[PDB]
C-alpha cells in the first residue's frame, strides 16, 4: 500500500493513506530519495492520516511525495555478523565495509521480558577503580548507571570500564552511541582495532557498534538506543552468553523525545518534558536486563541537565539501576577524578551477606568520616581550625586523605593527567582504606594520597615529597 | 530580566546603579564592578588612568570577597593586611560619591565637578596609602581629593 506526504514540520511528517493504514511503530520508506529515508509511524491522527517521526533529515521533502509501508517496524541485522561492524539507527552499515551478511534480522521494537524471566543472581564485578569497588561496586549481569552533569567524567569512566573489563571478557560487547560526539566514535573505533577487540581481517571481533550521534535529527536519536539494545538482546537469548552493553548517553533518548513532543501535539509536563517520559523510559529500560536465558551487564552514561539530579530525566532513571555512580562538578573542580561523589553513589550488593563484613565495614566507615567532615566544613571555615577537639581534627586530616585516596589515574585519561594509568585489585583497595581509617598514615602528608594507585604508591610518593 | 539583559549589548559604556549602594548613601549609586566601558584600554585612556582604575576595582573586589567573613565575625578577626584593604576600599567607595548640582536639596552640599586629572590623582593617592591616617567620613560627598583633606581637618 502507498501513501502521500501531506505535512512536514521539522522531524515530524504527516502521511495520508487511501487504502490500508500502517499500524503505529511501522517503518515507512520515503520514495525518491538518494539515501534511504525511513518514517516511523507514531500516531493515527484520524482521516486516513498518520503522524510519523523521521529517522533522517526532512529537507527535500515535498507534499504529495510517495511513501511505502514496509509492513513492519524497523528491522536490523542481528548475529555474529554485526561484530566489529558499525551500524546506524536502521541497521545500515556505516563503516564502509560492505553489506552485513546475517541469516536473520530483528524488530527494534519488542516486549520486555516478563517477571518470570527475572534473575536474582548477583555477584561482584570488580573494576580496579578504588571508589567504585569500595563504596558502590558493580554486579555481574547488573544494571549500572553513570550519573553526571556536563563534562564531569562519564565518558572517560565508561572508556575505562571498557578498558578494564571488556578486553578480558569471554563473551560479546555492544556499544551504542546515543546522541553523543561523533569524534568519540571514531576515537572508539580505532582504539578497539588497536586493542584487537575489533579485527578487520578475521572474525575474532568481540564488539558490535551502533551509532546515532548529536549530528543526527531527533527521530534517529530517539530510536538508536533500541537498535543497540536489540543487537544486545539477540546475543543474550539466541546464544545465551554474557553480553556487555555500553550506552553513552541514555539521556539523549529522552531529550530526543522531548524535541518532537510539541509537534506530536502533547501538552508539556514539568521542566518541558514529554508527559510520557517515565513510561517511554519504562518500555525501553525494561528490555535492558539479565534474564534466565542470558546475562547482560549493562553500563549507561546518564546526563544530568543543568547539574540538577532532580531533573525529571535523570531522576526517573535511578530506579532502573542496580548500581549508581554519581559524579559531581564540585568534586571535579577540586581535581578529584574520577569525580565520584562517595555520599551519593550506591549499590544493591553493598551488603555484608554479599561482599562480606570486612568490605562493608570499611566502606561504611569511609562514608562516615567523609560525611562527618562534610558537616564540619562550612562550620570550621569561619569558626577557625584551632577550636577543634584533637580527635575531631584527626577525622579532618583522615577524611581529607581518604578523599584523595579515592582519586586515581585512569589508563584512558593519560592525556589529561600526565600520570600513568593504574588498576587497583579489590583487596588492596579495602586494605588501603582500612589502613587510613586505622590511623596508620596520620604522619604522611595529604598530597601523598593524591592521584595514585595502591596504598604503596602513597607511601612512595611521600618520600619523593620529602625532597 | 529580558529587557535590560538584551539592552547591554547595544552600549559602548554602562553605568549600573545599585539600590543597595544608594541605601548606603553613596550617590551616584554606581556599582563600580558592574559598570564597564569599551574605551577602558591603556592605549586610549593612557596607562596611568588604566592602572589606577584596575587598582581601584581590584581593592574593591578583594574587599567584596572579605565581606562574608566580616558579616559573621566582623572587623577584628581579619589579619592586619585585610584590615588595610578594608579601610582603603571603604575610603575609596566614599570618594566615588559626589554631590550633584541637580541634587543639592537631598544632599545638603553644593554640587561638585571634578577634572579627570584630579579624579585620577585622588584615587591614586588613596591606593598608595597616602591617606591611611584619615577617617572614612572625610571622603564621603566631596569633589577633588583636597576637599576630603579639608573635611578631615574640619573634623578636628
Amino acid at each position: 500500500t502507498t501513501g502521500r506526504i501531506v505535512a512536514v514540520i521539522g522531524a515530524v511528517v504527516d502521511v495520508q493513506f487511501d487504502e490500508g493504514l500502517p499500524p503505529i511503530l511501522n517503518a515507512l520508506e520515503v520514495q525518491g530519495r538518494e539515501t534511504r529515508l525511513v518514517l516511523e509511524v507514531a500516531q493515527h491522527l484520524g482521516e486516513s492520516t498518520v503522524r510519523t517521526i523521521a529517522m533522517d533529515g526532512t529537507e527535500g521533502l515535498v507534499r504529495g511525495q510517495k511513501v511505502l509501508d514496509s509492513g513492519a517496524p524497523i528491522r536490523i541485522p542481528v548475529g555474529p555478523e554485526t561484530l566489529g561492524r558499525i551500524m546506524n539507527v536502521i541497521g545500515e552499515p556505516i563503516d564502509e565495509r560492505g553489506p552485513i551478511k546475517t541469516k536473520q534480522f530483528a524488530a527494534i521494537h519488542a516486549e520486555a521480558p516478563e517477571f518470570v524471566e527475572m534473575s536474582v543472581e548477583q555477584e561482584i564485578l570488580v573494576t580496579g577503580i578504588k571508589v567504585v569497588d569500595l563504596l558502590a561496586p558493580y554486579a555481574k549481569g547488573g544494571k549500572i548507571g553513570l550519573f553526571g552533569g556536563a563534562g564531569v567524567g562519564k565518558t572517560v569512566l565508561i572508556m575505562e570500564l571498557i578498558n578494564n573489563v571488556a578486553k578480558a571478557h569471554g563473551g560479546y560487547s555492544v556499544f551504542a552511541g546515543v546522541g553523543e560526539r561523533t569524534r568519540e566514535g571514531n576515537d572508539l573505533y580505532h582504539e578497539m582495532i588497536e586493542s584487537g577487540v575489533i579485527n578487520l581481517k578475521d572474525a575474532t571481533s568481540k564488539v558490535a557498534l551502533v551509532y546515532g550521534q548529536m549530528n543526527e535529527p531527533p527521530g534517529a536519536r530517539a530510536r538508536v538506543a533500541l537498535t543497540g539494545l536489540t543487537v544486545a538482546e539477540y546475543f543474550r537469548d539466541q546464544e545465551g552468553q554474557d553480553v556487555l552493553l555500553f550506552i553513552d548517553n541514555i539521556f539523549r533518548f529522552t531529550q530526543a523525545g522531548s524535541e518532537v513532543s510539541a509537534l506530536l501535539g502533547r501538552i508539556p509536563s514539568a521542566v518541558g518534558y514529554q508527559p510520557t517520559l517515565a513510561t517511554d523510559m519504562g518500555t525501553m529500560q525494561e528490555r535492558i536486563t539479565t534474564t534466565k536465558k542470558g546475562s547482560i551487564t549493562s553500563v549507561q552514561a546518564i546526563y544530568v541537565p543543568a547539574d540538577d539530579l532532580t531533573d525529571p530525566a535523570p531522576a526517573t532513571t535511578f530506579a532502573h539501576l542496580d548500581a549508581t555512580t554519581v559524579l559531581s562538578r564540585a568534586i571535579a573542580e577540586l581535581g578529584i577524578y574520577p569525580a565520584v561523589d562517595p555520599l551519593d553513589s550506591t549499590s544493591r550488593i553493598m551488603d555484608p551477606n554479599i561482599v562480606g563484613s570486612e568490605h562493608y565495614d570499611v566502606a561504611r566507615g569511609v562514608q562516615k568520616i567523609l560525611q562527618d567532615y562534610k558537616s564540619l566544613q562550612d562550620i570550621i571555615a569561619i569558626l577557625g581550625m584551632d577550636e577543634l577537639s584533637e580527635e575531631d581534627k584527626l577525622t579532618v586530616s583522615r577524611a581529607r586523605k581518604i578523599q584523595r585516596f579515592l582519586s586515581q589515574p585512569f589508563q584512558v585519561a593519560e592525556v589529561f593527567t600526565g600520570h600513568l594509568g593504574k588498576l587497583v585489585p579489590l583487596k588492596e583497595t579495602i586494605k588501603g582504606f582500612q589502613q587510613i581509617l586505622a590511623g596508620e598514615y596520620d604522619h604522611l602528608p595529604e598530597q601523598a594520597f593524591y592521584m595514585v594507585g595502591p596504598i604503596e604508591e602513597a607511601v612512595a610518593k611521600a618520600d619523593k615529597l620529602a625532597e | 530580566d529580558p529587557a535590560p539583559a538584551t539592552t547591554f549589548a547595544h552600549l559602548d559604556a554602562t553605568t549600573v546603579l545599585s539600590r543597595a549602594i544608594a541605601e548606603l548613601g553613596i550617590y551616584p549609586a554606581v556599582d563600580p564592578l558592574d559598570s564597564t566601558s569599551r574605551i577602558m584600554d591603556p592605549n586610549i585612556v593612557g596607562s596611568e588612568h588604566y592602572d589606577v582604575a584596575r587598582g581601584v576595582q581590584k581593592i574593591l573586589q578583594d574587599y567584596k570577597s572579605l565581606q562574608d567573613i566580616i558579616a559573621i565575625l566582623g572587623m577584628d578577626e581579619l589579619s592586619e593586611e585585610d584590615k588595610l584593604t578594608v579601610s582603603r576600599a571603604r575610603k575609596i567607595q566614599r570618594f566615588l560619591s559626589q554631590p550633584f548640582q541637580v541634587a543639592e536639596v537631598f544632599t545638603g552640599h553644593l554640587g561638585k565637578l571634578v577634572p579627570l586629572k584630579e579624579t585620577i590623582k585622588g584615587f591614586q593617592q588613596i591606593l598608595a596609602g597616602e591617606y591611611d591616617h584619615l577617617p572614612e567620613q572625610a571622603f564621603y560627598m566631596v569633589g577633588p581629593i583636597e576637599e576630603a583633606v579639608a573635611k578631615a581637618d574640619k573634623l578636628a
Partner: peptide, 22 residues
C-alpha cells in the same frame, strides 16, 4: 594574652603595643 582567638581585638591590641605570655 592567651592561646585562644575569637575574642575580638584582644591579641591584636597588645601586638600593636609590641618573651610573650600566651
Amino acid at each position: 594574652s592567651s592561646d585562644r582567638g575569637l575574642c575580638g581585638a584582644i591579641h591584636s591590641s597588645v601586638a600593636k603595643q609590641m618573651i610573650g605570655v600566651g
